[PDB]
Design a protein around this ligand. Structure first.
Ligand code: MTA
Length: 264
């Protein structure tokens, strides 16, 4: 893969990169290799969402992964068949947001150059399945920052705590716009999530989502606004030794879990 090879491949197939599909294709073989290495060992079947021109798909397959590749853009079928000629892969033409994720084998892996517009809801769904051993994927740098944020930083929020609840999170490296054709407007990052097997905790997330809803308020006032009894919230913060005017972004996962318990 190279900027010239990718441009040439698109042109030969009559393709354009379509923004409606968030198409930005990997253009660096070295980066492809680093993504594959980050996903090893392939202890379970691999799912790739958005195989595109098949560059990562081919590298995964050559590394011995058993791959299902889910692509929404049917126009990519000819180039994918060409790229993957002779190689065992399940190509599925479907919107990945509609794929039956809850039924994948326990121990499955995700390895993907995700389209920006589905990355957050897709990863959130896959985490809620509890079916994955590892998820390795590209997201915009700001989204990687949310997924790996520490408390009291701009990026810290509901997505940080959603990820933390289910999985260990790592931002492994960043990729400049030039690693893709066409180049996006922002940097990307390779994120690795390793699930602990924890499933959704809807009560905890009702609390977390209420906490971050009203961004201008203290935590107490945010939760009171969402219908939590104020006296009960006051007492629970106090019992935890937290300042009365503590803000939502100052609490870590442990603190939210204990706040929840105090309230019930
Ligand atoms: C970053 S390149 C994104 C890849 O994902 C594909 N894609 C975009 N939207 C979806 C979706 N909902 N399901 C599966 N693949 C998608 C694009 O066509 C491209 O190959």
């Amino acid at each position: 893969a190279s900027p010239q090879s990718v441009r040439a491949l698109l042109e030969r197939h009559g393709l354009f990169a379509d923004k409606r599909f968030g198409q930005n294709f990997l253009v660096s073989e070295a980066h492809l290799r680093r993504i594959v290495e980050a996903a090893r060992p392939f202890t379970g079947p691999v799912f790739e969402v958005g195989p595109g021109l098949g560059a990562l798909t081919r590298a995964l397959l050559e590394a011995g992964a058993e791959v299902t590749a889910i692509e929404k853009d049917l126009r990519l079928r000819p180039v994918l068949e060409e790229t993957l000629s002779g190689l065992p892969v399940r190509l599925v033409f479907q919107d990945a947001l509609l794929y039956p994720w809850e039924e994948v084998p326990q121990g499955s892996l995700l390895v993907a150059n995700l389209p920006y517009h589905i990355a957050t809801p897709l990863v959130t769904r896959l985490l809620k399945t509890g079916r994955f051993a590892r998820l390795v994927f590209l997201v915009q740098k700001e989204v990687a920052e949310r997924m790996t944020a520490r408390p009291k930083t701009p990026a810290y929020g509901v997505l940080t705590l959603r990820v933390a609840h289910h999985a260990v999170a790592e931002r492994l490296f960043d990729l400049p716009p030039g690693a893709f054709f066409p180049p996006p407007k922002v940097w990307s990052s390779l994120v690795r999530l390793t699930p602990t097997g924890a499933l959704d905790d809807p009560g905890l997330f009702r609390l977390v989502e209420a906490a971050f809803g009203k961004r201008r308020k203290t935590l107490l006032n945010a939760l009171a606004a969402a219908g939590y009894p104020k006296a009960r919230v006051e007492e629970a913060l106090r019992a935890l030794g937290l300042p009365p005017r503590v803000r939502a972004e100052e609490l870590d996962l442990e603190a939210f879990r204990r706040l929840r318990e105090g309230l019930e």
